[PDB]
Amino acid sequence: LIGACEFMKDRLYFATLRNRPKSTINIHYFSIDEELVYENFYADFGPLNLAMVYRYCCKLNKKLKSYSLSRKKIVHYTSFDQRKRANAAFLIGAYAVIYLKKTPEEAYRALLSGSNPPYLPFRDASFGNCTYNLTVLDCLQGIRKGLQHGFFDFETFDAEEYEHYERVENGDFNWIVPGKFLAFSGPHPKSKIENGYPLHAPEAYFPYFKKNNVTTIVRLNKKIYEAKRFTDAGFEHYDLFFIDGSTPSDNIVRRFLNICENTEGAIAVHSKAGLGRTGTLIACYVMKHYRFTHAEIIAWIRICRPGSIIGPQQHFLKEKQASLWVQGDIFRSKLK
């Protein structure tokens, strides 16, 4: 275990190993590299999504409470594939934050505690270069912030539901802020199957939305269904179009924040994929109202909905952070 990162004195370690190790009477080894696998869009490779973080933490907690392993060092290993290794490092750092009560900085210090190469930064889903480098530390800080503001709770998290509704066959949506924001791909005019691709019409969503207090739909992409189909059914509906892969005007950001601040229910936000444009505007709201940094919210939203926030949208959020924070301080003063 030379070079291994120690997370619990004489008890839990994170190791990078070129070949499969053999568990012994003294050491239990396990890897998730082939069990929890990131589903990529293009050259993005992580971070692993929230349900995969949950499944890891469940796996590890059971090992640490197991009688058969109670006298053993438990070693989470990953390989020399740096894209597997960054996700594996993210997983055990996140466990450290959630269950071992370490700060993101402590968890990350542990990840550097061996003699190991740096961890590769995560990147976006674009076809070019990505110069917004989302690090493992950023992802651990996003986890801490989500925990801090109750955006997830692994005592109640329902991974079967998460894994059900993320699928295009079941509507392709994810909660980003419980009770407040759901992100999804844009409905089509008719529920059907076209070239083996399942398409959902607005009405398909009504039961879930009504049951979960979705009062408002915000569309950010080109119109291919009549807004009336939602408003008839009782939903508020709003159009704030901006071009795929671009950043929204001040006017669009202003309008989005007013729409969301003036409902007490949840807002279902969509674009074409529900990734770039949708993630960018939700990020603006969460930076203003919860004071996430740009790195924390890009991490948090991608953990909930991989592929979210692309290309220039990333540097946009960094550029707008300071003013969104100010606008939030003003907003909260004018309360009371």
- In DSSP notation, 44-103 reads ---PPPHHHHHHHHHHHHHHHH-STTTTSEEEEEE-S-HHHHHHHHHHHHHHHHHTS---
Q: How are strands ordered across the β-sheet holding 236-239?
A: 173-177, 181-185, 266-271, 214-219, 236-239
Residue 186 lies in a domain: yes
Angle between helices 136-148 and 82-98 (to 10 degrees): 30
186 and 313 part of one domain: yes
Residue 298 lies in a domain: yes
Answer yes or no: are the C-beta atoms of 5 and 110 closer than 8 Å.
Answer: yes
3-class SS at 246?
A: coil
Termini Cα distance of the chain = 56
Residue type for 68, please? S
For tokens 């651990």, the residue is 140
DSSP 175: E
Backbone angles phi, psi at 188, to 5 degrees: -105, 165
Residue 127 lies in a domain: no
User: How many CB atoms sit inside 10 A of residue 39's CB?
Assistant: 11
Angle between helices 250-261 and 312-333 (to 10 degrees): 50
103 and 166 part of one domain: no
Q: Which of 122, 149, 168 is the last residue of a domain?
A: 122
183 and 298 part of one domain: yes
Q: What is the dihedral of CA 219, 223, 228, 234, to 10 degrees?
A: -20
Residue 151 lies in a domain: no
176 and 291 part of one domain: yes
**Resolution of the experimentally solved model in angstroms:** 1.6
**What is the rounded CA–CA span in Å between residue 297 and residue 289?**
12
**What is the rounded CA–CA span in Å between residue 19 and residue 77?**
10
Ordered DSSP codes for 265-317? SEEEEEESSSSHHHHHHHHHHHHHHH---HHHHHHHHHHHSTT-S-THHHHHH
222 and 290 part of one domain: yes
257 and 188 part of one domain: yes
Residue 56 lies in a domain: yes
Q: How many domains does the chain have?
A: 2
| Sequence-separated (6 or more) residues with CB below 8 Å from residue 10 | 73
**What is the rounded CA–CA span in Å between residue 205 and residue 249?**
29
| Sequence-separated (6 or more) residues with CB below 8 Å from residue 326 | none
For tokens 């993005």, the residue is 44
Residue 131 lies in a domain: no
Ordered DSSP codes for 193-239? EETTEEE--HHHHHHHHHHTTEEEEEE-S---S-THHHHHTT-EEEE
Q: Which of 122, 139, 174 is the last residue of a domain?
A: 122
16 and 92 part of one domain: yes
Ordered DSSP codes for 94-152? HHHHHTS---HHHHHHHHTSSS-PPPPPB--S-SS-----B-HHHHHHHHHHHHHTTS-
| Residue range of the domain that includes 254 | 159-333
Short-list 88, 85, 83, CA closest to 60: 88
**What is the rounded CA–CA span in Å between residue 271 and residue 50?**
22
For tokens 């550097």, the residue is 112
105 and 169 part of one domain: no
Short-list 126, 156, 122, CA closest to 139: 122
Residue 266 lies in a domain: yes
76 and 9 part of one domain: yes
Q: Which of 122, 141, 172 is the last residue of a domain?
A: 122
User: How many CB atoms sit inside 10 A of residue 329's CB?
Assistant: 12
For tokens 């059971």, the residue is 62
10 and 77 part of one domain: yes
**Is residue 85 classed exposed, middle or buried when 0-12, 13-18 and 19+ CB atoms within 10 A define those classes?**
buried
Answer yes or no: are the C-beta atoms of 84 and 15 closer than 8 Å.
Answer: no
* CATH number, domain containing residue 90: 3.90.190.10
67 and 185 part of one domain: no
**What is the rounded CA–CA span in Å between residue 173 and residue 106?**
33
**What is the rounded CA–CA span in Å between residue 33 and residue 144?**
24
Experimental determination approach used: X-ray
Residue 215 lies in a domain: yes
208 and 269 part of one domain: yes
